[PDB]
Amino acid sequence: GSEGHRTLASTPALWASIPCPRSELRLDLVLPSGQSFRWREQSPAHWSGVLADQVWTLTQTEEQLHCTVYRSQASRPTPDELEAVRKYFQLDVTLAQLYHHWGSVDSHFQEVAQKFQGVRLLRQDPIECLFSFICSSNNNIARITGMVERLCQAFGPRLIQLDDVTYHGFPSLQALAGPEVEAHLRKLGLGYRARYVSASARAILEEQGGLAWLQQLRESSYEEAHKALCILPGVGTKVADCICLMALDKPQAVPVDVHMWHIAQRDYSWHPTTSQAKGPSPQTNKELGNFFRSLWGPYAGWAQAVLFSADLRQ
DNA sequence: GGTAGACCTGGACGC
DNA sequence: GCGTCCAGTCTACC
Ligand SMILES: Nc1nc2nc(Br)[nH]c2c(=O)[nH]1
Ligand SMILES: [Ca+2]
């Protein structure tokens, strides 16, 4: 009853709502689609994960997003805590206004969007977002998900346990920069990225100026932010774009990967024109990004999130 | 300035 | 049951 993961039905008094129609958000289309890797549908239509250093379970009805938080006396999320959720899902951004616009200038988008509504971008923590995507390169979402879980279990603060699940906060820079981290990460199965994580944490803490340097890029320009991130080991064009779009408030950033290349070729008959290469390469990937920006506008990265999410569900 | 190949690690084929 | 193919970043040499 009071044990295990909560469900809206089981612990009624332990849930607070926030107005949000499925047209503004679809948990099942945002949480497991490769933006954040820390949410799990422990119970049908109920997603659990760490949000703002606390564990939460979320579920939705046609017009409501139901939230419950596990902190001592179990109580309802307060108005402030709920505000943290609104911020995570960037709810001030009207997804219906964006879909209308993109669909107005892109007939193919209008078509896909008609069946994949509620795909918006999570506003993530720079650090969590940075190392999670360092683990993403040349990998698949399912594997990346386990790597990130083992990484947080081994180096992150222990939060609380529900059923046989112990939740952990994302490791700090100091922890990731500690001694022998790479070796431990390799036993955890991160492959060659184990080096990127260790090397990137130290680089940030010992050469770039620490956490302030990262949290800073958020006020800088996409052009600025993207160049800086590429300095870090394991952070190429894609990873840096994912970070700019999902954690540094650069909504025009467009991560270019195998999925976006397939979407470009199959749904737009796109081809590189300013570059000599016929396939993926540093030059062609940059062109594709510009292409999608030119097509969708200022919030091109968000539109990209819709097609990418839709391309996974296949 | 612009490419071939190696990288870790499993699922998903295909024979 | 096995050898490939897949889901980006970094460097050789150009
Ligand atoms: N373009 C793109 N590539 C990605 N890889 C991962 Br893993 N997640 C994403 C994403 O949201 N967009
Ligand atoms: Ca590939």
PDB file of all heavy atoms in Angstrom, chain B residues 1-4 7 10 12, chain C residues 4-6 8 11-14:
ATOM      1  O5'  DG B   1      41.394  25.179 -44.696  1.00  0.00           O
ATOM      2  C5'  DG B   1      40.309  24.323 -44.325  1.00  0.00           C
ATOM      3  C4'  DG B   1      40.011  23.289 -45.386  1.00  0.00           C
ATOM      4  O4'  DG B   1      41.161  22.422 -45.535  1.00  0.00           O
ATOM      5  C3'  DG B   1      38.828  22.371 -45.071  1.00  0.00           C
ATOM      6  O3'  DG B   1      38.101  22.060 -46.267  1.00  0.00           O
ATOM      7  C2'  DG B   1      39.489  21.127 -44.509  1.00  0.00           C
ATOM      8  C1'  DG B   1      40.800  21.073 -45.273  1.00  0.00           C
ATOM      9  N9   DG B   1      41.885  20.461 -44.515  1.00  0.00           N
ATOM     10  C8   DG B   1      42.224  20.710 -43.207  1.00  0.00           C
ATOM     11  N7   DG B   1      43.239  20.001 -42.795  1.00  0.00           N
ATOM     12  C5   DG B   1      43.594  19.239 -43.900  1.00  0.00           C
ATOM     13  C6   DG B   1      44.626  18.278 -44.061  1.00  0.00           C
ATOM     14  O6   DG B   1      45.459  17.895 -43.229  1.00  0.00           O
ATOM     15  N1   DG B   1      44.635  17.748 -45.347  1.00  0.00           N
ATOM     16  C2   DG B   1      43.764  18.094 -46.351  1.00  0.00           C
ATOM     17  N2   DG B   1      43.940  17.472 -47.527  1.00  0.00           N
ATOM     18  N3   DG B   1      42.794  18.984 -46.213  1.00  0.00           N
ATOM     19  C4   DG B   1      42.769  19.513 -44.971  1.00  0.00           C
ATOM     20  P    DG B   2      36.736  21.208 -46.174  1.00  0.00           P
ATOM     21  OP1  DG B   2      35.873  21.621 -47.311  1.00  0.00           O
ATOM     22  OP2  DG B   2      36.211  21.291 -44.784  1.00  0.00           O
ATOM     23  O5'  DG B   2      37.210  19.712 -46.447  1.00  0.00           O
ATOM     24  C5'  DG B   2      37.632  19.310 -47.746  1.00  0.00           C
ATOM     25  C4'  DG B   2      37.838  17.815 -47.789  1.00  0.00           C
ATOM     26  O4'  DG B   2      39.050  17.448 -47.084  1.00  0.00           O
ATOM     27  C3'  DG B   2      36.712  17.007 -47.144  1.00  0.00           C
ATOM     28  O3'  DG B   2      36.477  15.827 -47.910  1.00  0.00           O
ATOM     29  C2'  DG B   2      37.290  16.632 -45.792  1.00  0.00           C
ATOM     30  C1'  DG B   2      38.751  16.437 -46.135  1.00  0.00           C
ATOM     31  N9   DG B   2      39.660  16.590 -45.005  1.00  0.00           N
ATOM     32  C8   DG B   2      39.671  17.604 -44.079  1.00  0.00           C
ATOM     33  N7   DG B   2      40.611  17.468 -43.185  1.00  0.00           N
ATOM     34  C5   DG B   2      41.259  16.295 -43.542  1.00  0.00           C
ATOM     35  C6   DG B   2      42.368  15.640 -42.947  1.00  0.00           C
ATOM     36  O6   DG B   2      43.024  15.980 -41.956  1.00  0.00           O
ATOM     37  N1   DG B   2      42.698  14.474 -43.627  1.00  0.00           N
ATOM     38  C2   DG B   2      42.051  13.999 -44.739  1.00  0.00           C
ATOM     39  N2   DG B   2      42.518  12.849 -45.249  1.00  0.00           N
ATOM     40  N3   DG B   2      41.021  14.605 -45.310  1.00  0.00           N
ATOM     41  C4   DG B   2      40.682  15.739 -44.662  1.00  0.00           C
ATOM     42  P    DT B   3      35.390  14.755 -47.414  1.00  0.00           P
ATOM     43  OP1  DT B   3      34.090  15.091 -48.051  1.00  0.00           O
ATOM     44  OP2  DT B   3      35.467  14.616 -45.936  1.00  0.00           O
ATOM     45  O5'  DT B   3      35.919  13.402 -48.054  1.00  0.00           O
ATOM     46  C5'  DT B   3      35.699  12.163 -47.405  1.00  0.00           C
ATOM     47  C4'  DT B   3      36.951  11.321 -47.459  1.00  0.00           C
ATOM     48  O4'  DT B   3      38.011  11.955 -46.699  1.00  0.00           O
ATOM     49  C3'  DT B   3      36.756   9.942 -46.841  1.00  0.00           C
ATOM     50  O3'  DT B   3      37.430   8.961 -47.612  1.00  0.00           O
ATOM     51  C2'  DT B   3      37.382  10.066 -45.467  1.00  0.00           C
ATOM     52  C1'  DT B   3      38.491  11.066 -45.699  1.00  0.00           C
ATOM     53  N1   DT B   3      38.801  11.849 -44.491  1.00  0.00           N
ATOM     54  C2   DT B   3      39.816  11.401 -43.675  1.00  0.00           C
ATOM     55  O2   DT B   3      40.479  10.405 -43.919  1.00  0.00           O
ATOM     56  N3   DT B   3      40.028  12.165 -42.555  1.00  0.00           N
ATOM     57  C4   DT B   3      39.346  13.306 -42.179  1.00  0.00           C
ATOM     58  O4   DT B   3      39.647  13.883 -41.139  1.00  0.00           O
ATOM     59  C5   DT B   3      38.299  13.725 -43.085  1.00  0.00           C
ATOM     60  C7   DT B   3      37.508  14.953 -42.758  1.00  0.00           C
ATOM     61  C6   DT B   3      38.084  12.987 -44.182  1.00  0.00           C
ATOM     62  P    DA B   4      36.620   7.680 -48.123  1.00  0.00           P
ATOM     63  OP1  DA B   4      36.111   7.984 -49.484  1.00  0.00           O
ATOM     64  OP2  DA B   4      35.668   7.281 -47.054  1.00  0.00           O
ATOM     65  O5'  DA B   4      37.740   6.558 -48.232  1.00  0.00           O
ATOM     66  C5'  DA B   4      37.634   5.365 -47.470  1.00  0.00           C
ATOM     67  C4'  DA B   4      38.896   5.137 -46.672  1.00  0.00           C
ATOM     68  O4'  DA B   4      39.153   6.272 -45.807  1.00  0.00           O
ATOM     69  C3'  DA B   4      38.784   3.924 -45.755  1.00  0.00           C
ATOM     70  O3'  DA B   4      40.000   3.180 -45.752  1.00  0.00           O
ATOM     71  C2'  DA B   4      38.488   4.526 -44.395  1.00  0.00           C
ATOM     72  C1'  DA B   4      39.209   5.856 -44.448  1.00  0.00           C
ATOM     73  N9   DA B   4      38.570   6.891 -43.633  1.00  0.00           N
ATOM     74  C8   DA B   4      37.300   7.393 -43.770  1.00  0.00           C
ATOM     75  N7   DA B   4      37.006   8.333 -42.902  1.00  0.00           N
ATOM     76  C5   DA B   4      38.157   8.453 -42.138  1.00  0.00           C
ATOM     77  C6   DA B   4      38.490   9.281 -41.051  1.00  0.00           C
ATOM     78  N6   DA B   4      37.665  10.191 -40.531  1.00  0.00           N
ATOM     79  N1   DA B   4      39.718   9.142 -40.511  1.00  0.00           N
ATOM     80  C2   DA B   4      40.549   8.233 -41.035  1.00  0.00           C
ATOM     81  N3   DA B   4      40.357   7.403 -42.056  1.00  0.00           N
ATOM     82  C4   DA B   4      39.126   7.564 -42.572  1.00  0.00           C
ATOM     83  P    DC B   7      41.054  -1.654 -32.899  1.00  0.00           P
ATOM     84  OP1  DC B   7      42.344  -1.407 -32.198  1.00  0.00           O
ATOM     85  OP2  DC B   7      40.824  -2.948 -33.596  1.00  0.00           O
ATOM     86  O5'  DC B   7      39.873  -1.432 -31.852  1.00  0.00           O
ATOM     87  C5'  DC B   7      38.720  -0.689 -32.219  1.00  0.00           C
ATOM     88  C4'  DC B   7      38.581   0.531 -31.343  1.00  0.00           C
ATOM     89  O4'  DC B   7      37.959   1.591 -32.100  1.00  0.00           O
ATOM     90  C3'  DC B   7      37.706   0.313 -30.117  1.00  0.00           C
ATOM     91  O3'  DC B   7      38.188   1.082 -29.016  1.00  0.00           O
ATOM     92  C2'  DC B   7      36.338   0.775 -30.583  1.00  0.00           C
ATOM     93  C1'  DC B   7      36.653   1.850 -31.619  1.00  0.00           C
ATOM     94  N1   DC B   7      35.761   1.829 -32.787  1.00  0.00           N
ATOM     95  C2   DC B   7      35.070   2.988 -33.128  1.00  0.00           C
ATOM     96  O2   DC B   7      35.211   3.995 -32.422  1.00  0.00           O
ATOM     97  N3   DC B   7      34.268   2.983 -34.217  1.00  0.00           N
ATOM     98  C4   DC B   7      34.146   1.874 -34.949  1.00  0.00           C
ATOM     99  N4   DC B   7      33.356   1.916 -36.023  1.00  0.00           N
ATOM    100  C5   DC B   7      34.833   0.671 -34.613  1.00  0.00           C
ATOM    101  C6   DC B   7      35.621   0.693 -33.535  1.00  0.00           C
ATOM    102  P    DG B  10      27.743  -6.201 -23.145  1.00  0.00           P
ATOM    103  OP1  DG B  10      26.450  -6.074 -22.431  1.00  0.00           O
ATOM    104  OP2  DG B  10      28.947  -6.651 -22.403  1.00  0.00           O
ATOM    105  O5'  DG B  10      27.556  -7.191 -24.370  1.00  0.00           O
ATOM    106  C5'  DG B  10      26.348  -7.916 -24.547  1.00  0.00           C
ATOM    107  C4'  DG B  10      25.259  -7.000 -25.054  1.00  0.00           C
ATOM    108  O4'  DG B  10      25.764  -6.110 -26.080  1.00  0.00           O
ATOM    109  C3'  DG B  10      24.097  -7.758 -25.686  1.00  0.00           C
ATOM    110  O3'  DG B  10      22.868  -7.121 -25.372  1.00  0.00           O
ATOM    111  C2'  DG B  10      24.379  -7.656 -27.171  1.00  0.00           C
ATOM    112  C1'  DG B  10      25.031  -6.292 -27.284  1.00  0.00           C
ATOM    113  N9   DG B  10      25.965  -6.169 -28.399  1.00  0.00           N
ATOM    114  C8   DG B  10      27.216  -6.725 -28.496  1.00  0.00           C
ATOM    115  N7   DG B  10      27.833  -6.408 -29.602  1.00  0.00           N
ATOM    116  C5   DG B  10      26.930  -5.601 -30.281  1.00  0.00           C
ATOM    117  C6   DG B  10      27.041  -4.949 -31.539  1.00  0.00           C
ATOM    118  O6   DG B  10      27.998  -4.944 -32.328  1.00  0.00           O
ATOM    119  N1   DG B  10      25.887  -4.240 -31.848  1.00  0.00           N
ATOM    120  C2   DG B  10      24.769  -4.163 -31.055  1.00  0.00           C
ATOM    121  N2   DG B  10      23.750  -3.434 -31.536  1.00  0.00           N
ATOM    122  N3   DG B  10      24.657  -4.758 -29.878  1.00  0.00           N
ATOM    123  C4   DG B  10      25.767  -5.454 -29.556  1.00  0.00           C
ATOM    124  P    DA B  12      16.092  -8.010 -30.291  1.00  0.00           P
ATOM    125  OP1  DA B  12      14.852  -7.217 -30.071  1.00  0.00           O
ATOM    126  OP2  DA B  12      16.129  -9.442 -29.896  1.00  0.00           O
ATOM    127  O5'  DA B  12      16.530  -7.890 -31.815  1.00  0.00           O
ATOM    128  C5'  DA B  12      16.823  -6.614 -32.384  1.00  0.00           C
ATOM    129  C4'  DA B  12      17.273  -6.779 -33.815  1.00  0.00           C
ATOM    130  O4'  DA B  12      18.686  -7.093 -33.877  1.00  0.00           O
ATOM    131  C3'  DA B  12      16.550  -7.921 -34.524  1.00  0.00           C
ATOM    132  O3'  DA B  12      16.191  -7.545 -35.850  1.00  0.00           O
ATOM    133  C2'  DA B  12      17.577  -9.041 -34.536  1.00  0.00           C
ATOM    134  C1'  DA B  12      18.879  -8.270 -34.647  1.00  0.00           C
ATOM    135  N9   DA B  12      20.053  -8.969 -34.123  1.00  0.00           N
ATOM    136  C8   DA B  12      20.177  -9.643 -32.934  1.00  0.00           C
ATOM    137  N7   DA B  12      21.366 -10.155 -32.737  1.00  0.00           N
ATOM    138  C5   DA B  12      22.075  -9.800 -33.877  1.00  0.00           C
ATOM    139  C6   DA B  12      23.403 -10.041 -34.282  1.00  0.00           C
ATOM    140  N6   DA B  12      24.286 -10.732 -33.554  1.00  0.00           N
ATOM    141  N1   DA B  12      23.795  -9.541 -35.475  1.00  0.00           N
ATOM    142  C2   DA B  12      22.909  -8.853 -36.205  1.00  0.00           C
ATOM    143  N3   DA B  12      21.637  -8.565 -35.934  1.00  0.00           N
ATOM    144  C4   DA B  12      21.277  -9.071 -34.740  1.00  0.00           C
TER     145       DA B  12
ATOM    146  P    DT C   4      33.223 -11.615 -40.674  1.00  0.00           P
ATOM    147  OP1  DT C   4      34.008 -11.747 -41.931  1.00  0.00           O
ATOM    148  OP2  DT C   4      33.923 -11.308 -39.398  1.00  0.00           O
ATOM    149  O5'  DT C   4      32.096 -10.515 -40.914  1.00  0.00           O
ATOM    150  C5'  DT C   4      30.834 -10.626 -40.262  1.00  0.00           C
ATOM    151  C4'  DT C   4      29.747  -9.992 -41.098  1.00  0.00           C
ATOM    152  O4'  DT C   4      28.475 -10.294 -40.482  1.00  0.00           O
ATOM    153  C3'  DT C   4      29.823  -8.471 -41.170  1.00  0.00           C
ATOM    154  O3'  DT C   4      29.320  -8.004 -42.427  1.00  0.00           O
ATOM    155  C2'  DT C   4      28.955  -8.023 -40.009  1.00  0.00           C
ATOM    156  C1'  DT C   4      27.919  -9.135 -39.875  1.00  0.00           C
ATOM    157  N1   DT C   4      27.612  -9.482 -38.474  1.00  0.00           N
ATOM    158  C2   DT C   4      26.301  -9.452 -38.057  1.00  0.00           C
ATOM    159  O2   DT C   4      25.376  -9.133 -38.787  1.00  0.00           O
ATOM    160  N3   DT C   4      26.112  -9.808 -36.746  1.00  0.00           N
ATOM    161  C4   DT C   4      27.080 -10.177 -35.830  1.00  0.00           C
ATOM    162  O4   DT C   4      26.758 -10.477 -34.684  1.00  0.00           O
ATOM    163  C5   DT C   4      28.434 -10.178 -36.333  1.00  0.00           C
ATOM    164  C7   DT C   4      29.549 -10.560 -35.414  1.00  0.00           C
ATOM    165  C6   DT C   4      28.629  -9.834 -37.611  1.00  0.00           C
ATOM    166  P    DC C   5      29.273  -6.424 -42.727  1.00  0.00           P
ATOM    167  OP1  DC C   5      29.085  -6.250 -44.192  1.00  0.00           O
ATOM    168  OP2  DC C   5      30.428  -5.776 -42.055  1.00  0.00           O
ATOM    169  O5'  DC C   5      27.942  -5.954 -41.988  1.00  0.00           O
ATOM    170  C5'  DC C   5      26.665  -6.431 -42.412  1.00  0.00           C
ATOM    171  C4'  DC C   5      25.561  -5.691 -41.693  1.00  0.00           C
ATOM    172  O4'  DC C   5      25.414  -6.178 -40.337  1.00  0.00           O
ATOM    173  C3'  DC C   5      25.778  -4.181 -41.580  1.00  0.00           C
ATOM    174  O3'  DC C   5      24.537  -3.498 -41.786  1.00  0.00           O
ATOM    175  C2'  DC C   5      26.259  -4.011 -40.149  1.00  0.00           C
ATOM    176  C1'  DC C   5      25.461  -5.085 -39.435  1.00  0.00           C
ATOM    177  N1   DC C   5      26.027  -5.568 -38.163  1.00  0.00           N
ATOM    178  C2   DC C   5      25.156  -5.839 -37.101  1.00  0.00           C
ATOM    179  O2   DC C   5      23.941  -5.647 -37.255  1.00  0.00           O
ATOM    180  N3   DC C   5      25.658  -6.300 -35.934  1.00  0.00           N
ATOM    181  C4   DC C   5      26.972  -6.488 -35.802  1.00  0.00           C
ATOM    182  N4   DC C   5      27.421  -6.956 -34.635  1.00  0.00           N
ATOM    183  C5   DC C   5      27.884  -6.209 -36.863  1.00  0.00           C
ATOM    184  C6   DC C   5      27.374  -5.754 -38.015  1.00  0.00           C
ATOM    185  P    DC C   6      24.539  -1.927 -42.123  1.00  0.00           P
ATOM    186  OP1  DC C   6      23.630  -1.691 -43.276  1.00  0.00           O
ATOM    187  OP2  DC C   6      25.956  -1.481 -42.198  1.00  0.00           O
ATOM    188  O5'  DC C   6      23.859  -1.278 -40.838  1.00  0.00           O
ATOM    189  C5'  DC C   6      24.085  -1.843 -39.556  1.00  0.00           C
ATOM    190  C4'  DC C   6      23.039  -1.376 -38.573  1.00  0.00           C
ATOM    191  O4'  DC C   6      23.278  -2.111 -37.357  1.00  0.00           O
ATOM    192  C3'  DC C   6      23.135   0.101 -38.196  1.00  0.00           C
ATOM    193  O3'  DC C   6      21.844   0.611 -37.826  1.00  0.00           O
ATOM    194  C2'  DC C   6      24.094   0.093 -37.021  1.00  0.00           C
ATOM    195  C1'  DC C   6      23.881  -1.277 -36.380  1.00  0.00           C
ATOM    196  N1   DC C   6      25.139  -1.922 -35.971  1.00  0.00           N
ATOM    197  C2   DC C   6      25.221  -2.509 -34.702  1.00  0.00           C
ATOM    198  O2   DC C   6      24.218  -2.497 -33.968  1.00  0.00           O
ATOM    199  N3   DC C   6      26.386  -3.072 -34.311  1.00  0.00           N
ATOM    200  C4   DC C   6      27.440  -3.071 -35.134  1.00  0.00           C
ATOM    201  N4   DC C   6      28.572  -3.628 -34.700  1.00  0.00           N
ATOM    202  C5   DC C   6      27.378  -2.496 -36.437  1.00  0.00           C
ATOM    203  C6   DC C   6      26.220  -1.940 -36.812  1.00  0.00           C
ATOM    204  P    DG C   8      24.588   7.565 -34.477  1.00  0.00           P
ATOM    205  OP1  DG C   8      24.427   8.192 -35.815  1.00  0.00           O
ATOM    206  OP2  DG C   8      24.654   6.087 -34.364  1.00  0.00           O
ATOM    207  O5'  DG C   8      25.906   8.171 -33.815  1.00  0.00           O
ATOM    208  C5'  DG C   8      26.331   9.501 -34.103  1.00  0.00           C
ATOM    209  C4'  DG C   8      27.413   9.922 -33.135  1.00  0.00           C
ATOM    210  O4'  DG C   8      28.388   8.866 -33.011  1.00  0.00           O
ATOM    211  C3'  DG C   8      28.200  11.160 -33.548  1.00  0.00           C
ATOM    212  O3'  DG C   8      28.621  11.842 -32.361  1.00  0.00           O
ATOM    213  C2'  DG C   8      29.361  10.570 -34.330  1.00  0.00           C
ATOM    214  C1'  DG C   8      29.613   9.242 -33.626  1.00  0.00           C
ATOM    215  N9   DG C   8      29.988   8.142 -34.503  1.00  0.00           N
ATOM    216  C8   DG C   8      29.342   7.749 -35.648  1.00  0.00           C
ATOM    217  N7   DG C   8      29.853   6.675 -36.183  1.00  0.00           N
ATOM    218  C5   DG C   8      30.912   6.348 -35.350  1.00  0.00           C
ATOM    219  C6   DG C   8      31.827   5.271 -35.415  1.00  0.00           C
ATOM    220  O6   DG C   8      31.871   4.343 -36.237  1.00  0.00           O
ATOM    221  N1   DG C   8      32.755   5.329 -34.384  1.00  0.00           N
ATOM    222  C2   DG C   8      32.790   6.292 -33.408  1.00  0.00           C
ATOM    223  N2   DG C   8      33.779   6.186 -32.506  1.00  0.00           N
ATOM    224  N3   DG C   8      31.928   7.290 -33.324  1.00  0.00           N
ATOM    225  C4   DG C   8      31.024   7.257 -34.322  1.00  0.00           C
ATOM    226  P    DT C  11      42.147  12.871 -31.129  1.00  0.00           P
ATOM    227  OP1  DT C  11      42.889  12.816 -29.844  1.00  0.00           O
ATOM    228  OP2  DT C  11      41.617  14.170 -31.619  1.00  0.00           O
ATOM    229  O5'  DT C  11      43.073  12.255 -32.261  1.00  0.00           O
ATOM    230  C5'  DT C  11      42.495  11.510 -33.317  1.00  0.00           C
ATOM    231  C4'  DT C  11      43.505  10.553 -33.898  1.00  0.00           C
ATOM    232  O4'  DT C  11      42.846   9.845 -34.968  1.00  0.00           O
ATOM    233  C3'  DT C  11      44.695  11.255 -34.540  1.00  0.00           C
ATOM    234  O3'  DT C  11      45.856  10.411 -34.486  1.00  0.00           O
ATOM    235  C2'  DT C  11      44.209  11.522 -35.954  1.00  0.00           C
ATOM    236  C1'  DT C  11      43.202  10.403 -36.225  1.00  0.00           C
ATOM    237  N1   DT C  11      41.953  10.872 -36.856  1.00  0.00           N
ATOM    238  C2   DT C  11      41.294  10.023 -37.717  1.00  0.00           C
ATOM    239  O2   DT C  11      41.698   8.903 -37.988  1.00  0.00           O
ATOM    240  N3   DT C  11      40.136  10.536 -38.248  1.00  0.00           N
ATOM    241  C4   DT C  11      39.583  11.781 -38.008  1.00  0.00           C
ATOM    242  O4   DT C  11      38.533  12.103 -38.557  1.00  0.00           O
ATOM    243  C5   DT C  11      40.326  12.617 -37.096  1.00  0.00           C
ATOM    244  C7   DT C  11      39.803  13.981 -36.774  1.00  0.00           C
ATOM    245  C6   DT C  11      41.459  12.129 -36.576  1.00  0.00           C
ATOM    246  P    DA C  12      47.307  11.004 -34.867  1.00  0.00           P
ATOM    247  OP1  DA C  12      48.228  10.661 -33.753  1.00  0.00           O
ATOM    248  OP2  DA C  12      47.170  12.420 -35.296  1.00  0.00           O
ATOM    249  O5'  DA C  12      47.710  10.135 -36.137  1.00  0.00           O
ATOM    250  C5'  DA C  12      46.696   9.677 -37.021  1.00  0.00           C
ATOM    251  C4'  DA C  12      47.173   8.486 -37.815  1.00  0.00           C
ATOM    252  O4'  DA C  12      46.056   8.014 -38.602  1.00  0.00           O
ATOM    253  C3'  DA C  12      48.271   8.816 -38.819  1.00  0.00           C
ATOM    254  O3'  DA C  12      49.102   7.672 -39.039  1.00  0.00           O
ATOM    255  C2'  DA C  12      47.496   9.195 -40.067  1.00  0.00           C
ATOM    256  C1'  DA C  12      46.227   8.355 -39.972  1.00  0.00           C
ATOM    257  N9   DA C  12      45.033   9.087 -40.384  1.00  0.00           N
ATOM    258  C8   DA C  12      44.029   8.689 -41.233  1.00  0.00           C
ATOM    259  N7   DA C  12      43.092   9.593 -41.402  1.00  0.00           N
ATOM    260  C5   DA C  12      43.507  10.654 -40.608  1.00  0.00           C
ATOM    261  C6   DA C  12      42.949  11.917 -40.350  1.00  0.00           C
ATOM    262  N6   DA C  12      41.807  12.342 -40.883  1.00  0.00           N
ATOM    263  N1   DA C  12      43.616  12.739 -39.513  1.00  0.00           N
ATOM    264  C2   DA C  12      44.764  12.312 -38.976  1.00  0.00           C
ATOM    265  N3   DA C  12      45.388  11.150 -39.138  1.00  0.00           N
ATOM    266  C4   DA C  12      44.700  10.356 -39.976  1.00  0.00           C
ATOM    267  P    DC C  13      50.302   7.761 -40.099  1.00  0.00           P
ATOM    268  OP1  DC C  13      50.994   6.448 -40.104  1.00  0.00           O
ATOM    269  OP2  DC C  13      51.076   9.000 -39.823  1.00  0.00           O
ATOM    270  O5'  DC C  13      49.547   7.937 -41.487  1.00  0.00           O
ATOM    271  C5'  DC C  13      50.090   8.749 -42.524  1.00  0.00           C
ATOM    272  C4'  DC C  13      49.114   8.836 -43.672  1.00  0.00           C
ATOM    273  O4'  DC C  13      47.896   9.477 -43.214  1.00  0.00           O
ATOM    274  C3'  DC C  13      49.601   9.653 -44.871  1.00  0.00           C
ATOM    275  O3'  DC C  13      49.210   9.009 -46.089  1.00  0.00           O
ATOM    276  C2'  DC C  13      48.882  10.980 -44.712  1.00  0.00           C
ATOM    277  C1'  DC C  13      47.571  10.559 -44.074  1.00  0.00           C
ATOM    278  N1   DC C  13      46.936  11.617 -43.272  1.00  0.00           N
ATOM    279  C2   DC C  13      45.655  12.054 -43.627  1.00  0.00           C
ATOM    280  O2   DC C  13      45.081  11.515 -44.586  1.00  0.00           O
ATOM    281  N3   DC C  13      45.075  13.048 -42.918  1.00  0.00           N
ATOM    282  C4   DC C  13      45.721  13.596 -41.887  1.00  0.00           C
ATOM    283  N4   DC C  13      45.114  14.578 -41.218  1.00  0.00           N
ATOM    284  C5   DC C  13      47.021  13.160 -41.494  1.00  0.00           C
ATOM    285  C6   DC C  13      47.585  12.177 -42.207  1.00  0.00           C
ATOM    286  P    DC C  14      49.472   9.735 -47.500  1.00  0.00           P
ATOM    287  OP1  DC C  14      49.966   8.700 -48.444  1.00  0.00           O
ATOM    288  OP2  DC C  14      50.278  10.962 -47.268  1.00  0.00           O
ATOM    289  O5'  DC C  14      48.012  10.171 -47.967  1.00  0.00           O
ATOM    290  C5'  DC C  14      47.819  11.036 -49.083  1.00  0.00           C
ATOM    291  C4'  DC C  14      46.397  11.549 -49.097  1.00  0.00           C
ATOM    292  O4'  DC C  14      46.121  12.174 -47.821  1.00  0.00           O
ATOM    293  C3'  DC C  14      46.120  12.623 -50.144  1.00  0.00           C
ATOM    294  O3'  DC C  14      44.716  12.664 -50.419  1.00  0.00           O
ATOM    295  C2'  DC C  14      46.451  13.901 -49.395  1.00  0.00           C
ATOM    296  C1'  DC C  14      45.964  13.579 -47.988  1.00  0.00           C
ATOM    297  N1   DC C  14      46.719  14.245 -46.914  1.00  0.00           N
ATOM    298  C2   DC C  14      46.039  15.102 -46.039  1.00  0.00           C
ATOM    299  O2   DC C  14      44.821  15.280 -46.198  1.00  0.00           O
ATOM    300  N3   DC C  14      46.725  15.712 -45.044  1.00  0.00           N
ATOM    301  C4   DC C  14      48.036  15.494 -44.908  1.00  0.00           C
ATOM    302  N4   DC C  14      48.672  16.116 -43.910  1.00  0.00           N
ATOM    303  C5   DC C  14      48.752  14.630 -45.786  1.00  0.00           C
ATOM    304  C6   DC C  14      48.062  14.032 -46.766  1.00  0.00           C
TER     305       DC C  14
END
